[PDB]
Amino acid sequence: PQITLWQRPLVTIKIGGQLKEALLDTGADDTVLEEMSLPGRWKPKMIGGIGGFIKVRQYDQILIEICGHKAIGTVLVGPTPVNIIGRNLLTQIGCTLNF
Amino acid sequence: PQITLWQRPLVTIKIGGQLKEALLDTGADDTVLEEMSLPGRWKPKMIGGIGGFIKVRQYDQILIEICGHKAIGTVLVGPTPVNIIGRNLLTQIGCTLNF
Ligand SMILES: CC(C)(C)OC(=O)N[C@@H](Cc1ccccc1)[C@@H](O)CN[C@@H](Cc1ccccc1)C(=O)N[C@@H](CCC(=O)O)C(=O)N[C@@H](Cc1ccccc1)C(N)=O
């Protein structure tokens, strides 16, 4: 689909068998989701954005479904004000910036 | 042009008669540029992103040229680790998210 940018490009994602809603961030290297219950063993990490670095829990090989498309990638879980779909996954559903 | 997301979508911008380079952020509501010399009177503001809020200096009616296209908008200047081209301007050069 073609998403314009007059409204925040929010997209519904199904991850962990839960229904969420995520921002499509092209400035985000990683996909960082809010706090939630996720299966498997993880590892502690630290990411930075405008404002500072946050300690997030990292998960690899994680299936997620953004607007119907499936993609198995690494998801960071931490105190993010909004779910963020970054390039690690945006590339998997084949997303482009056309202007 | 069509920009893929395997590499950070960096784009060269000419603002304030200076040559810069900015990230194309679709998750950014505002266009926030690093510290620099800019003409006109401004106003103090505060924006938040993953990590916290930062006190930035706001400027309105500001011409900028992203990849050759011109657009007069509001630019926030503050301690941002990287120049960010947000939706306030991304909409002006007619940018879309196609996946
Ligand atoms: C998550 C991680 C993988 C670490 O990537 C980044 O943080 N990337 C950021 C750039 C970067 C990368 C690497 C190193 C340094 C810096 C940027 O692209 C993130 N994009 C969005 C992510 C986001 C959006 C919305 C909510 C939370 C988070 C953003 O900062 N957006 C800010 C940019 C600053 C700005 O324009 O103000 C924004 O639009 N903030 C709005 C909306 C908002 C809502 C809630 C709270 C605070 C702010 C605002 N009003 O200030």
CSV table of C-alpha atoms and ligand atoms in Angstrom, one decimal:
chain,number,residue,atom,x,y,z
A,1,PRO,CA,0.0,0.0,0.0
A,2,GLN,CA,0.9,3.6,-0.4
A,3,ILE,CA,1.0,5.5,2.8
A,4,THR,CA,1.1,9.4,2.8
A,5,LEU,CA,2.6,11.3,5.6
A,6,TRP,CA,-0.1,13.8,6.7
A,7,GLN,CA,-1.0,11.5,9.6
A,8,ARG,CA,1.6,9.5,11.6
A,9,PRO,CA,2.2,6.4,9.5
A,10,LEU,CA,0.7,4.0,12.1
A,11,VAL,CA,0.3,0.4,11.0
A,12,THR,CA,-1.3,-2.5,12.8
A,13,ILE,CA,1.0,-5.4,13.7
A,14,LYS,CA,0.4,-8.8,15.2
A,15,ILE,CA,3.4,-9.9,17.3
A,16,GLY,CA,3.5,-12.5,20.0
A,17,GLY,CA,0.0,-13.4,19.1
A,18,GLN,CA,-1.2,-10.0,20.3
A,19,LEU,CA,-2.6,-7.1,18.3
A,20,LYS,CA,-0.6,-3.9,18.5
A,21,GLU,CA,-0.1,-0.8,16.4
A,22,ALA,CA,3.3,0.5,15.3
A,23,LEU,CA,4.9,3.6,13.9
A,24,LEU,CA,6.7,3.1,10.6
A,25,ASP,CA,10.1,4.7,11.4
A,26,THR,CA,12.6,5.0,8.6
A,27,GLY,CA,15.0,6.8,11.0
A,28,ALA,CA,14.9,3.8,13.3
A,29,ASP,CA,17.7,1.3,12.7
A,30,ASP,CA,16.0,-1.2,15.0
A,31,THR,CA,12.4,-2.3,15.7
A,32,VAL,CA,11.7,-1.4,19.3
A,33,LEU,CA,8.4,-2.3,20.8
A,34,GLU,CA,6.9,-1.2,24.2
A,35,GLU,CA,6.9,-3.5,27.2
A,36,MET,CA,5.1,-6.8,26.7
A,37,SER,CA,5.1,-10.6,27.3
A,38,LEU,CA,7.4,-12.3,24.8
A,39,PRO,CA,8.6,-16.0,24.5
A,40,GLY,CA,12.2,-17.1,24.6
A,41,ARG,CA,15.6,-16.1,26.1
A,42,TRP,CA,16.8,-12.5,25.6
A,43,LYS,CA,19.8,-10.2,26.0
A,44,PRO,CA,20.2,-6.7,27.5
A,45,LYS,CA,21.0,-3.8,25.1
A,46,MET,CA,21.1,0.0,24.9
A,47,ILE,CA,19.8,2.2,22.1
A,48,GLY,CA,19.9,5.9,21.6
A,49,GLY,CA,17.5,8.4,19.9
A,50,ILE,CA,16.8,12.1,20.3
A,51,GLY,CA,16.7,12.4,24.0
A,52,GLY,CA,19.0,9.7,25.2
A,53,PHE,CA,19.8,6.0,25.4
A,54,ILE,CA,17.4,3.4,26.8
A,55,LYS,CA,18.1,-0.1,28.2
A,56,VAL,CA,16.0,-2.5,26.2
A,57,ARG,CA,15.7,-6.3,26.1
A,58,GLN,CA,16.6,-7.9,22.8
A,59,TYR,CA,14.9,-10.8,21.1
A,60,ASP,CA,16.0,-12.5,17.9
A,61,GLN,CA,14.2,-14.7,15.3
A,62,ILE,CA,10.8,-13.2,16.1
A,63,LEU,CA,7.9,-13.5,13.7
A,64,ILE,CA,5.8,-10.4,13.4
A,65,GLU,CA,3.1,-9.5,11.0
A,66,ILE,CA,2.9,-5.9,9.8
A,67,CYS,CA,-0.2,-5.2,7.7
A,68,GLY,CA,-0.6,-8.9,6.8
A,69,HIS,CA,3.1,-9.4,5.8
A,70,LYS,CA,5.1,-11.8,7.9
A,71,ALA,CA,8.8,-11.2,8.8
A,72,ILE,CA,11.1,-13.0,11.2
A,73,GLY,CA,13.5,-10.6,12.8
A,74,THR,CA,15.1,-9.1,16.0
A,75,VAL,CA,12.8,-7.1,18.2
A,76,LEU,CA,13.9,-4.8,21.0
A,77,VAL,CA,11.5,-4.5,24.0
A,78,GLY,CA,11.9,-1.5,26.3
A,79,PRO,CA,10.4,1.8,27.6
A,80,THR,CA,9.6,3.3,24.2
A,81,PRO,CA,6.7,5.8,24.2
A,82,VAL,CA,5.4,4.2,20.9
A,83,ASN,CA,6.0,1.0,19.1
A,84,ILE,CA,8.5,1.5,16.3
A,85,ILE,CA,9.0,-0.6,13.2
A,86,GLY,CA,12.5,0.1,12.0
A,87,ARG,CA,14.6,-0.9,9.0
A,88,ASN,CA,15.5,-4.4,10.3
A,89,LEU,CA,11.9,-5.3,9.5
A,90,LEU,CA,10.9,-2.5,7.1
A,91,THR,CA,13.3,-4.0,4.5
A,92,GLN,CA,11.6,-7.4,4.9
A,93,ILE,CA,8.1,-6.3,3.9
A,94,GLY,CA,9.8,-4.5,1.0
A,95,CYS,CA,9.1,-0.9,2.0
A,96,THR,CA,10.3,2.1,0.0
A,97,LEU,CA,10.6,5.9,0.3
A,98,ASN,CA,9.3,7.4,-2.9
A,99,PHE,CA,9.3,11.1,-3.5
B,1,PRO,CA,13.5,9.1,-6.4
B,2,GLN,CA,13.0,5.7,-4.9
B,3,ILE,CA,15.0,5.2,-1.7
B,4,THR,CA,15.3,1.7,-0.3
B,5,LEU,CA,16.0,1.1,3.4
B,6,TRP,CA,19.1,-1.1,3.5
B,7,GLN,CA,21.2,2.0,4.3
B,8,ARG,CA,20.0,4.8,6.5
B,9,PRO,CA,18.0,7.1,4.1
B,10,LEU,CA,20.3,10.0,4.2
B,11,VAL,CA,19.7,12.9,1.9
B,12,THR,CA,21.6,16.1,1.2
B,13,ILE,CA,19.9,19.3,2.2
B,14,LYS,CA,20.8,22.9,1.6
B,15,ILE,CA,19.5,25.1,4.4
B,16,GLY,CA,20.6,28.5,5.6
B,17,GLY,CA,22.9,28.6,2.5
B,18,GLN,CA,24.9,25.7,4.0
B,19,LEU,CA,25.3,22.1,2.8
B,20,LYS,CA,24.1,19.5,5.3
B,21,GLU,CA,22.9,15.9,5.2
B,22,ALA,CA,19.7,14.7,6.8
B,23,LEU,CA,18.0,11.5,7.8
B,24,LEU,CA,14.5,11.0,6.3
B,25,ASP,CA,12.5,10.3,9.4
B,26,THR,CA,8.9,9.3,8.9
B,27,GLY,CA,8.5,8.8,12.7
B,28,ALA,CA,9.5,12.4,13.2
B,29,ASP,CA,6.6,14.8,13.4
B,30,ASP,CA,9.0,17.8,13.3
B,31,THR,CA,12.2,18.6,11.3
B,32,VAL,CA,14.9,19.0,13.8
B,33,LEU,CA,18.4,20.0,12.7
B,34,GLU,CA,21.7,20.1,14.7
B,35,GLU,CA,23.1,23.3,16.0
B,36,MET,CA,23.9,26.0,13.4
B,37,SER,CA,23.8,29.6,12.5
B,38,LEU,CA,20.3,30.6,11.4
B,39,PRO,CA,18.6,34.0,10.5
B,40,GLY,CA,15.6,35.5,12.1
B,41,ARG,CA,13.9,35.6,15.5
B,42,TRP,CA,13.0,32.2,17.2
B,43,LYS,CA,11.2,30.6,20.1
B,44,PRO,CA,12.1,28.0,22.7
B,45,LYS,CA,10.5,24.5,22.5
B,46,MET,CA,10.7,21.0,23.8
B,47,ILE,CA,10.4,17.7,21.8
B,48,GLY,CA,10.5,14.1,22.9
B,49,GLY,CA,11.7,11.0,21.2
B,50,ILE,CA,13.0,7.6,22.5
B,51,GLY,CA,15.3,8.7,25.3
B,52,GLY,CA,13.8,11.9,26.5
B,53,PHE,CA,12.8,15.5,25.6
B,54,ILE,CA,15.2,18.1,24.4
B,55,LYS,CA,15.0,21.9,24.5
B,56,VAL,CA,15.2,23.1,20.9
B,57,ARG,CA,15.1,26.6,19.3
B,58,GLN,CA,12.2,26.9,16.8
B,59,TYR,CA,12.2,28.8,13.5
B,60,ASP,CA,9.3,29.2,11.2
B,61,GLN,CA,9.0,30.1,7.5
B,62,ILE,CA,12.4,28.6,6.6
B,63,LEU,CA,13.3,27.6,3.1
B,64,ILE,CA,15.2,24.4,2.8
B,65,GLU,CA,16.2,22.3,-0.2
B,66,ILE,CA,16.0,18.5,0.2
B,67,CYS,CA,17.4,16.7,-2.9
B,68,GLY,CA,16.8,19.8,-5.1
B,69,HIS,CA,13.2,20.3,-4.0
B,70,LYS,CA,12.4,23.6,-2.1
B,71,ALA,CA,10.1,23.8,0.8
B,72,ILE,CA,9.4,26.6,3.3
B,73,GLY,CA,8.6,25.3,6.8
B,74,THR,CA,9.3,25.3,10.5
B,75,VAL,CA,12.7,24.0,11.6
B,76,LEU,CA,13.7,23.0,15.1
B,77,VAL,CA,17.4,23.6,16.0
B,78,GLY,CA,18.8,21.7,19.0
B,79,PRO,CA,21.2,19.0,20.4
B,80,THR,CA,20.0,16.3,18.0
B,81,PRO,CA,22.7,13.6,17.2
B,82,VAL,CA,21.7,13.7,13.5
B,83,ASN,CA,19.7,16.1,11.2
B,84,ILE,CA,16.1,14.9,10.9
B,85,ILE,CA,13.7,15.7,8.1
B,86,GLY,CA,10.3,15.1,9.5
B,87,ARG,CA,6.7,15.1,8.2
B,88,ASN,CA,6.3,18.9,8.3
B,89,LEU,CA,8.6,19.0,5.3
B,90,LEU,CA,8.4,15.4,4.0
B,91,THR,CA,4.9,16.1,3.0
B,92,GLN,CA,6.0,19.2,1.0
B,93,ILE,CA,8.4,17.4,-1.3
B,94,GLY,CA,5.6,14.9,-1.7
B,95,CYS,CA,7.2,11.8,-0.1
B,96,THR,CA,5.4,8.4,0.2
B,97,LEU,CA,5.8,5.1,2.0
B,98,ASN,CA,5.2,2.4,-0.5
B,99,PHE,CA,5.3,-1.2,0.5
C,1,LIG,C1,14.7,3.5,18.3
C,1,LIG,C2,16.1,3.6,17.7
C,1,LIG,C3,16.4,2.3,16.9
C,1,LIG,C4,17.2,3.8,18.8
C,1,LIG,O1,16.2,4.7,16.7
C,1,LIG,C5,16.0,6.1,17.0
C,1,LIG,O2,15.8,6.6,18.1
C,1,LIG,N1,16.1,6.8,15.8
C,1,LIG,C6,16.0,8.2,15.8
C,1,LIG,C7,17.2,8.8,15.1
C,1,LIG,C8,18.5,8.4,15.7
C,1,LIG,C9,19.0,7.1,15.3
C,1,LIG,C10,20.2,6.6,15.9
C,1,LIG,C11,20.9,7.4,16.8
C,1,LIG,C12,20.4,8.7,17.1
C,1,LIG,C13,19.2,9.1,16.6
C,1,LIG,C14,14.7,8.8,15.1
C,1,LIG,O3,14.6,8.4,13.8
C,1,LIG,C15,13.4,8.2,15.9
C,1,LIG,N2,12.2,8.6,15.1
C,1,LIG,C16,11.0,9.0,16.0
C,1,LIG,C17,10.7,7.9,17.0
C,1,LIG,C18,9.5,8.2,17.9
C,1,LIG,C19,8.4,8.8,17.4
C,1,LIG,C20,7.3,9.1,18.2
C,1,LIG,C21,7.3,8.8,19.5
C,1,LIG,C22,8.4,8.2,20.0
C,1,LIG,C23,9.5,7.9,19.2
C,1,LIG,C24,11.2,10.3,16.8
C,1,LIG,O4,12.3,10.5,17.4
C,1,LIG,N3,10.2,11.2,16.7
C,1,LIG,C25,10.3,12.4,17.4
C,1,LIG,C26,11.4,13.3,16.8
C,1,LIG,C27,11.5,14.7,17.4
C,1,LIG,C28,10.4,15.6,17.1
C,1,LIG,O5,10.1,15.8,15.9
C,1,LIG,O6,9.8,16.2,18.0
C,1,LIG,C29,8.9,13.1,17.4
C,1,LIG,O7,8.3,13.1,16.3
C,1,LIG,N4,8.5,13.6,18.5
C,1,LIG,C30,7.2,14.2,18.6
C,1,LIG,C31,6.1,13.2,19.1
C,1,LIG,C32,6.3,12.8,20.5
C,1,LIG,C33,5.3,11.9,21.1
C,1,LIG,C34,5.5,11.5,22.4
C,1,LIG,C35,6.6,12.0,23.2
C,1,LIG,C36,7.5,12.8,22.6
C,1,LIG,C37,7.3,13.2,21.3
C,1,LIG,C38,7.1,15.5,19.5
C,1,LIG,N5,5.9,16.0,19.8
C,1,LIG,O8,8.2,15.9,19.9
